[PDB]
Amino acid sequence: IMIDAASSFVLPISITKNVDVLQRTDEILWFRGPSVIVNERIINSGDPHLSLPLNRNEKESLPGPFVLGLRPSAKFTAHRLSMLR
């Protein structure tokens, strides 16, 4: 199992006309596999949607993925911006 493969490639034709949105070298970088989209980085480790307790067929349409991601409440953020100045 090797480590030092290249795994990125560049085509010789300068097509740099409509490409300011992609990832440029500074040309266009062309990798050997796709990307990986990760929804939320921090798992919410309790929350019986995920913990599955052993007590007591049901569906639930939760709002967004933001339930599973430890977001702070806004009153603390306003308190901290008041503590800013």
Partner 1 sequence: HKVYICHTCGNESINVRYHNLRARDTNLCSRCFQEGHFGANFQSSDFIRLENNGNSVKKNWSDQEMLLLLEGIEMYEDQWEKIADHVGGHKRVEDCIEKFLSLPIEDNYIREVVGSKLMECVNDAVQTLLQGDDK
Partner 2 sequence: KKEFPVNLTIKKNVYDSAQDFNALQDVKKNWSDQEMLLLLEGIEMYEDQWEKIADHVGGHKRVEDCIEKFLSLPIEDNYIREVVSKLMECVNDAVQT
Partner 3 sequence: LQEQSELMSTVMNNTPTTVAALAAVAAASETNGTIPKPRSSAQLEQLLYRYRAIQNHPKENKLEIKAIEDTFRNISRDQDIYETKLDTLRKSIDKGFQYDEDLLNKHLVALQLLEKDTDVPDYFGDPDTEIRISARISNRINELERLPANLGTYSLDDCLEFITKDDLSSRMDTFKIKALVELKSLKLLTKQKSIRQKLINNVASQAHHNIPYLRDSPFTAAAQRSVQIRSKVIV
Q: For residues 74 and 30, what is the distance between their CA atoms, to the nearest angstrom?
A: 41
Choose the one of partner 1, partner 3, partner 2, none that binds residue 39, judging by a C-beta under 5 to 8 angstroms depending on kind: partner 3
Report if residue 72 touches partner 3, rule: CB under 8 A.
Answer: yes
The C-alpha atoms of residue 39 and residue 49 are separated, in whole angstroms, by 17
Total residues at interface with partner 1 (CB under 8 A): 15
Tokens standing for 30? 């062309």
* Nearer residue to partner 2 within complex by CB, 20 or 76: 76
The answer to whether 66 and 42 are in contact (CB under 8 A) is: no
Residues that bind partner 3 (CB under 8 A): 38-42, 53-55, 70, 72, 76-77, 80-81, 84
